[PDB]
């Protein structure tokens, strides 16, 4: 995670490599995100920084508000839609994949969340489960 770790991430199998355009979930004024890095990444030769649910990432909003388009900013995936294995043998998935903008400490820059969140990112980032509607 970095700093925002009340609990570590058991490995959620990767489903959003670099360049992915994952939707924006908040009330910030953005619409969709573009993954440009992974914080806490790996490093293997000719291997992308591939993130998953709850990975703090760098991203650019390609599209929206003029003060939120075209810059570098941290983000938190909340929805993956690549099916991963929880410890208790259940593979769940979505069809949307999305994240929120964050600050480098971990509160959301936007004060709402559109849609469900995951239990993993709920346990891993506490401001989300405050700001989520539902949690699964």
């Amino acid at each position: 995670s970095g700093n925002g770790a009340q609990g570590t991430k058991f490995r959620i199998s990767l489903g959003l490599p670099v360049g992915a355009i994952m939707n924006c979930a908040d009330n910030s004024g953005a619409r969709n995100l573009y993954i440009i890095a992974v914080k806490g990444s790996g490093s293997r030769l000719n291997r992308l920084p591939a993130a998953s649910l709850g990975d703090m990432v760098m991203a650019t909003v390609k599209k929206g508000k003029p003060e939120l388009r075209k810059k570098v900013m941290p983000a938190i995936v909340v929805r993956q839609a690549k099916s991963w294995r929880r410890r208790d043998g259940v593979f769940l998935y979505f069809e949307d994949n999305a994240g929120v903008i964050a600050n480098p400490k971990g509160e959301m820059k936007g004060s709402a969340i559109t849609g469900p969140v995951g239990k993993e990112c709920a346990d891993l980032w506490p401001r989300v489960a405050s700001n989520s509607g539902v949690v699964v």
Binding site: L92, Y93, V136
Partner: protein, 61 residues
Amino acid sequence: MKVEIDSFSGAKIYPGRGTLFVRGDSKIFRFQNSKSASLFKQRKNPRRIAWTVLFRKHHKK
């Protein structure tokens, strides 16, 4: 623990088995196998697929 019901076809899902789809409005669907999973992505109607328990209930067998 407990053993469950297919969200399409109505059959016991012993855990370890199956997948779990969630919609954008947070709707939780469970599927024992890719037969029921792919049929829901093809939006097949449970009251029409003739081995579904909803078929069983709608045709009273």
